[PDB]
Amino acid sequence: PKKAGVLGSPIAHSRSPQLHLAAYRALGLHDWTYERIECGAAELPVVVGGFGPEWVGVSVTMPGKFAALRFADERTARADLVGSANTLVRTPHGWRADNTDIDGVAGALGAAAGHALVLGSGGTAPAAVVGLAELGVTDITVVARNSDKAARLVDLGTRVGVATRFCAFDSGGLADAVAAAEVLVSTIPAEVAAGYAGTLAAIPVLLDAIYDPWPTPLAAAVGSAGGRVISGLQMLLHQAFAQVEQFTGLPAPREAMTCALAAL
């Protein structure tokens, strides 16, 4: 019997356990556990360092993804690329960090086209840029309140080979930018995105990182316009696949986990 779980703060509303435990059950690992652990960035090394032998790995959500990357002694190329880690996996002599949020975005969208818009400069925005690139997006516009963080974002886009640019939230380029874009990935609070819903509504595809509560005003706006709408639950589903494979050494049982998600 092995142990995994999810670290973050707050953590009470994580739907990670539902996904992972459904996977372990489908895989015949009926005796494995997965627990929610209240844990801020400073406490991450306390918790992970205290893990007994039977811990195979842990998921890490806000606010500890930067601490997780630094705590690990090995990091995947992609974890380095986005600058944070949502996944710690025990190895012979320590921990390996990875970032599966990239899979979260690429897998949730399933397929992307040419032009994308990313709302927000932090959180899962870097993963969204890399995932969009993975899908064959040639062009990305970063709409964000923090011009400095957004500068680092365009740089990453530039580095993964995507024509990438910045646009201020109230500069007046939002209509233009929405017009050229096929896909919108929003990583900002629903409360913040809400006021721009009218302008963003015409995007053909929305990926909203938010999942609770649902629908966000943005999702409702896009939905009413007939755009394809994908919630953060779909993101959660797809980032979890690679975590299950790394924790168990077995293919993610996607159907079982998709069923578990429908229950959510």
Ligand X SMILES: O=C(O)C1=C[C@@H](O)[C@H](O)[C@H](O)C1
Any idea which residues carry the catalytic annotation? Answer: 65
Quote the distance between the C-alpha of residue 243 and its chain's center.
12
For ligand X, which residue of 101, 103, 139, 208 counts as binding (CB under 6 A)?
101
Instruction: Name which of 125 and 203 has its Cβ closer to ligand X.
Output: 125
Tell me which of 4, 5, 14, 227 binds ligand X, using CB under 6 A. Answer: 14
The answer for residues whose C-beta is within 8 angstroms of residue 37's C-beta and 6 or more apart is 5, 6, 7, 8, 11, 47, 58
Say if CB 45 and CB 73 are below 8 A apart.
no
Q: How many residues of this chain bind ligand X (CB under 6 A)? A: 9
The owner of tokens 């979890």 is 240
- Non-local (6+) Cβ contacts of 66 within 8 A are 41, 83, 84
The token pair at 38 is 């209240």
- Pick from 59, 76, 164, 186 the residue near ligand X by CB under 6 A: 59
Q: Which of residues 15-54 bind ligand X (CB under 6 A)?
A: 16
CB burial of 3-27 (b: ≥16 within 10 Å; e: otherwise) equals bbbbbbbebeebbbbbbbbbbbebb
Question: Which of 23, 48, 55, 61 touches ligand X (CB under 6 A)?
Answer: 61
- Map residue 130 onto helix, strand or coil: helix
Shortest gap between Cβ of 6 and ligand X (angstroms)? 5
Q: Which is nearer to ligand X, 85 or 193 (CB)?
A: 85
Residue 32 tokens read as 């494995």
Please report how close the Cβ of residue 65 comes to ligand X at its closest, in angstroms.
7
Q: How far is the CB of 239 from ligand X (least distance, A)?
A: 5
Nearer Cβ to ligand X, position 166 or 211? Answer: 211
Least Å distance between CB 153 and ligand X? Answer: 18
Nearer of residues 126 and 227 to ligand X, judged by Cβ? 126
Contact set for ligand X, span 225-254 (CB under 6 A): 236, 239
Contacts of 71 (CB under 8 A, 6+ apart): 44, 45, 48, 88, 95, 97
Instruction: Report residue 10: phi and psi, to 5°.
Output: -75, 165
Using CB under 6 A, pick the residue from 6, 21, 39, 88 that binds ligand X: 6
5, 26, 82, 86: which one binds ligand X (CB under 6 A): 86
Residue 84 interacts with ligand X (CB under 6 A): yes or no: no
Closest approach of ligand X to the CB of residue 86, in Å: 3
What radius of gyration do the chain's Cα atoms show? Answer: 18
Residues forming the site for ligand X (CB under 6 A): 6, 14, 16, 59, 61, 86, 101, 236, 239
